[PDB]
Structure 1
Amino acid sequence: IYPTVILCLFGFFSMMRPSEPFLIPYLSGPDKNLTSAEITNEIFPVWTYSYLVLLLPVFVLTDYVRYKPVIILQGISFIITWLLLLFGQGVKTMQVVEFFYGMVTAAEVAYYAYIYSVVSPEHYQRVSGYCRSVTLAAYTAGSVLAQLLVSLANMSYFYLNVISLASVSVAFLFSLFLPMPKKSMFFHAKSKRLFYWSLWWAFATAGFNQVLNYVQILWDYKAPSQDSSIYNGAVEAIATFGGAVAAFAVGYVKVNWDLLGELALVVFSVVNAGSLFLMHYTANIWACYAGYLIFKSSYMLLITIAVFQIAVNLNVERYALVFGINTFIALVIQTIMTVIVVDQRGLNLPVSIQFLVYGSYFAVIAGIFLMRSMYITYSTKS
């Protein structure tokens, strides 16, 4: 009745942010005057470190304090992040906003744990799917709004950032009076083949997060971002719509998975690597846009399948206890690969080269997972 509507409106107004599609074009513009090397190699890598640091503390804080204060914390973190994007000028200030965005992403778990904590035991997946769909629709509508406003009204990215601050303010106001849960999930004390799909999910989502962290900066290299020649809002709206319809198509089609799940996963990883190589090698911005859509759709198929083979035979209380470990492994892998690749203390690689590395990473994951299926040679050779 009431708590679900409050959470739905909070999620919609939090996710609806026209600033995010045009972030690096706004950061690498006259408003901030930040070179691409600075954002690529000093500012953005801080997000992965902040998220990895804050994952587990936020994970236990959500459980301990009954999931509402962490939602208000995410709201005030949104407030601070977008206020400091609106009124911040400096590499250190942008590292701070990256830390606060990592805090936002870490605290996002509360928005979904509160759902299980407050809804009736009769069903959880229905309201969880509605909440996820409302967040996705909010993001898509925000991207389309940003694209339309930029294209028609000639409206600067400062005004879009203002709109995002207003939206997150309304979201925080809505999260102010969420009813309190009366129970926690595992505030008490705490198959082997699941290790396969856990590794699949961890590696694929580490690659996806690291790719998304720098897709826009790659778009910046092909065409002048500070000009109006870019189409980030429409492109990212189409990308998230394609990802959503792709994740739904996996449920629309009901095929056996215990037989060809690994084959589907390796095929999708191969397509991911191909899309990344298309992004890296091409010279046209539209080819990179199409590669982004293809990669997002293929990764969404891959992760929908991987989450199915983890969640079919898992308890609802163990869903969180397993996905927390899986995303911790994913963040460990992403932080290691970022320190080796992106961070200035490592190789200081421009985004014009990072995407070859990402495509090779996906290709190597697919190849090694196929090679682990080495039992083909032993049985066939008799």
Structure 2
Amino acid sequence: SWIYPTVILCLFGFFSMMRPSEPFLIPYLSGPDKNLTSAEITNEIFPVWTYSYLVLLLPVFVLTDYVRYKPVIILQGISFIITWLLLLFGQGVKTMQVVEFFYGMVTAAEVAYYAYIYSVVSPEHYQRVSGYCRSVTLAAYTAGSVLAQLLVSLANMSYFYLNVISLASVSVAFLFSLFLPMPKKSVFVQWFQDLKECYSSKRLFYWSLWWAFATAGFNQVLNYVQILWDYKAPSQDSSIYNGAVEAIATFGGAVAAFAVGYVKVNWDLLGELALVVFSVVNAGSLFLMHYTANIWACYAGYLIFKSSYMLLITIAVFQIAVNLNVERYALVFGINTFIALVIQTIMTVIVVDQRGLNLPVSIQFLVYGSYFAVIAGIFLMRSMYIT
């Protein structure tokens, strides 16, 4: 019953996220293969990704539910092929901006990937499926990560062929997405009112509020944890270690996601308790990374933070899916992701941008830990009052 769509979507999300070039993305397109400058790379190529992500998330939650979640997934499969074909056979800054654009399309449609499996299975499985889905994606990343390192350490395989393997992987994901079962059929202000009825759930305007604010800080930590590690321990082994300490971290997240799916625990009443415990765990882990001048303890702190976040976000997605009581699975996921990315953009503007605070990475993770400490504090105080 639920097994067939779940296996196909897990295969799609595995082969679509098994990307060996993701770690060595910067070495690929800043070395002899492309000679993109580091000045033109993070100031002209990468910033296009956030804008494309925003302006393509705008249709994705408006129109994903109407199209029954498969054409957007298929659009991700095609955009995966186009993105890595353009990376693989593209030259110049203008081309990589288009690459970024298609990557933003890829992620805005990965939102639909997350919603689709809820669109096809009964709510009784919504827990299990949830973990499995997230797990496979994380697992895929870890696989790709380690595979990349292996292909750089035992085969001396260039970044070009890593991108070739990435294209081969995401092309198989397109074939798996072609086999996904089609879900069965279900002015401006009116639409807004519908949104009000969609978010009306007490435990879904709360879980969504956690989703909106937690993943922004999580993305920020993902982006600048490499910089934090480089600052804490300057060494010549960052290429084989840093990404390697984020390969197992992701693996931990995977297990954490697989923790939600496998075990049969009533999350409806442990949801608040688990939310507050793992949010204060995220805060303590982020403070652990900043305060200790030892990269071995900071690695464990990052692993704990990533695992607890992945478990919490799996719980959040599951609880939003079951308590939604409307078909708008991608509308809530899409709007949550869009608001989270808006918060991430605003806060990365204030804290790390030159025109803002321009805080170094020494205080950046103190700020991130304070921010998460604030999310944990709001949920902790709200839960304490209710009781």
- Shorter-chain TM-score bucket reads 0.7 to 0.9
> Which stretch shifts more, 131-140 or 353-362?
131-140
1:242 Cα shift? 0.9
Q: SS state of the match for residue 186, structure 2?
A: coil
Check whether the contact 2:135–2:258 (CA below 8 A) recurs between aligned residues: no
Render the CA deviation track for 1:220-246: whole Å, top value 9, x for unaligned: 556779867523554333122211222
Question: Using the alignment, how far apart are the partners of 1:287 and 1:210 within structure 2?
Answer: 20
What are the ranges of 5 or more consecutive residues in structure 2 without an aligned counterpart?
189-198
Q: Which residue in 2 is equivalent to 1:343?
A: 353
Contact 2:52 2:104 (8 Å CA) reproduced: yes
Q: 1:303 aligns with which of 287, 307, 313?
A: 313
- Cα deviation, 1:17-51, whole Å, max 9, x if unaligned, reads 11113333445545455666765565444433322
Identity of aligned residues (%): 99
Contact 2:16 2:169 survives alignment (8 Å): yes
For residue 10 of structure 1, report the CA deviation from its aligned partner: 3.2
Q: Hey, what's the Cα distance between the residues in 1 that align with 2:7 and 2:262? A: 27
Q: Is the 2:136–2:254 Cα contact (8 Å) retained in structure 1?
A: no
Report the CA distance between 1:151 and its aligned residue.
Answer: 2.1
SS at match of 1:44: helix
Contact 1:279 1:355 in 2 (8 A): yes
Match of 1:127 in 2: 129
Range that drifts further, 12-21 or 250-259: 250-259
Report the Cα offset of residue 311 of structure 1. Answer: 4.6
356-365 or 92-101, which deviates more: 92-101
Contact 2:283 2:373 in 1 (8 A): yes
Give the SS at the match of 1:289.
helix
Pair 1:258 & 2:268 matched: yes
Judged with a 3 Å threshold, the aligned counterparts in structure 2 of structure 1 residues 279 and 23 are, in CA distance, closer, same or farther, namely farther
Aligned residues: 375
Q: 1:126 to 1:325 in 2, by over 3 A?
A: same
Q: CA deviation at 1:104?
A: 0.5
Change (3 A) 1:76 1:257: closer
Segment drifting more, 262-271 vs 51-60: 262-271
Q: What TM-score results when the alignment is normalised by the length of structure 2?
A: 0.76
State the Cα distance separating 1:3 from its structure 2 match. 6.6
How far apart, in 1, do the equivalents of 2:253 and 2:300 lie?
Answer: 13
Contact 1:223 1:229 in 2 (8 A): no
8 Å Cα contact 2:48/2:101 also seen in 1: yes
Question: 1:257: Cα distance to partner?
Answer: 6.5
Deviation at 1:105, TM superposition (A): 0.8
Contact 1:51 1:105 in 2 (8 A): yes
Stretches of structure 1 that go unaligned for 5 or more consecutive residues are 377-381
Task: Note if contact 2:351-2:357 (Cα within 8 Å) is conserved in structure 1.
Answer: yes
Query: Given the superposition, is the C-alpha separation of residues 73 and 318 from structure 1 closer, same or farther in structure 2, using an over 3 Å criterion?
Result: closer
Deviates more, 1:192-201 or 1:154-163: 192-201
Deviation at 1:53, TM superposition (A): 2.1
What TM-score do you get using the length of structure 1 for normalisation?
0.77
In 2, Cα distance between the equivalents of 1:128 and 1:192? 21
Q: Distance in 2 between matches of 1:258 and 1:124?
A: 12
- Per-residue deviation at 1:94? 4.1
Residue in structure 2 matching 1:240, options 220, 242, 250? 250
